[PDB]
Structure formats: structure tokens, C-alpha cells
Amino acid sequence: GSHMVGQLSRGAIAAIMQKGDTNIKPILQVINIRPITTGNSPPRYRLLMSDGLNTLSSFMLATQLNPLVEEEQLSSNCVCQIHRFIVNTLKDGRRVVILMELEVLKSAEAVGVKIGNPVPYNE
Numbered sequence: 131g132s133h134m135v136g137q138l139s140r141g142a143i144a145a146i147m148q149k150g151d152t153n154i155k156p157i158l159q160v161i162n163i164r165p166i167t168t169g170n171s172p173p174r175y176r177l178l179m180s181d182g183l184n185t186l187s188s189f190m191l192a193t194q195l196n197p198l199v200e201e202e203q204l205s206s207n208c209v210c211q212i213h214r215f216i217v218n219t220l221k222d223g224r225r226v227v228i229l230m231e232l233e234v235l236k237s238a239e240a241v242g243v244k245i246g247n248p249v250p251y252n253e
């Protein structure tokens with residue numbers, strides 16, 4: 131409906147990256163999904179997600195969720211609620227947000243556009 135950005139958990143990206151709070155169940159929009167280079171492993175997917183204010187490209191799907199992508203319920207423009215995630219920090223200091231459980235609240239076809247004008251989150 132009207133006020134589309136009101137559908138998304140504005141500020142959740144900053145909260146995840148600044149406070150590391152994991153009890154939240156934020157509602158985010160998928161902007162894009164792509165495989166990352168794997169060799170002899172199951173494929174792994176990276177997501178560019180939006181909370182309406184920011185985008186963040188450091189989301190990775192737990193492999194148990196791969197069927198959501200491969201059967202196309204999880205795709206660009208869909209709106210989803212994250213029910214379980216963890217943050218991991220690499221040796222170089224970069225953080226990755228691993229999505230363990232999520233629910234698609236609105237299909238890509240039912241949303242159809244990038245909501246709002248989110249800007250990339252900086253570190």
C-alpha cells in the first residue's frame with residue numbers, strides 16, 4: 131500500500147552493524163541475489179538487502195535456505211522478515227550477516243520495485 135518504505139525496518143541495517151543486536155526480526159527488501167564463487171561445495175548466495183534507508187551487500191544465505199532462491203520464492207524485490215541471523219567477522223575486519231531463517235512476506239511480483247531510495251551503508 132501507500133507509504134511503501136513504511137513496510138521496511140528502517141534503521142535495522144545500522145542496528146545490525148553498529149550494535150550487533152540479534153533479537154530483532156527486521157523486515158528487509160531483497161535488491162539483488164547472486165551466487166558467490168564456490169568450487170566443490172553447495173552453491174552459496176550473497177544478497178544486497180535494503181531496510182529502506184540503507185542497502186548492505188554483506189548478507190549471505192545459509193545453505194539450508196538455498197531452495198528459496200533456486201525455486202524463486204526469494205528474488206529481487208521481494209520483502210522478507212529475518213527470523214534468525216548471525217554476524218561473523220572476518221580476519222580483515224569485514225562483517226558478514228548470515229541469514230539462517232527468513233519468511234517471504236511479499237513476493238517479488240507483488241512488490242515489483244525497489245522501495246524508497248536507500249543508500250549504501252558504510253562499514
Ligand SMILES: Cc1cccc(-n2nc(C(=O)O)cc2-c2ccccc2)c1
Nearest residue numbers: 165166167176187188189190224225226
Ligand atoms: C564481506 C562479504 C560479505 C558477503 C559475501 C562476501 N563474499 N563475496 C564473495 C564473492 O564471490 O563475490 C566472496 C565472499 C566471501 C565471504 C566470506 C569469506 C570469504 C569470501 C564477502
Ligand SMILES: O=C(O)c1ccc(-c2ccc(F)c(Cl)c2)o1
Nearest residue numbers: 190191192193194218219226228
Ligand atoms: O549454514 C550456513 O550455510 C552457514 C553458517 C555460517 C556460515 C558462514 C558463511 C559465510 C561466512 F563467511 C561465514 Cl564466517 C560463515 O554459513
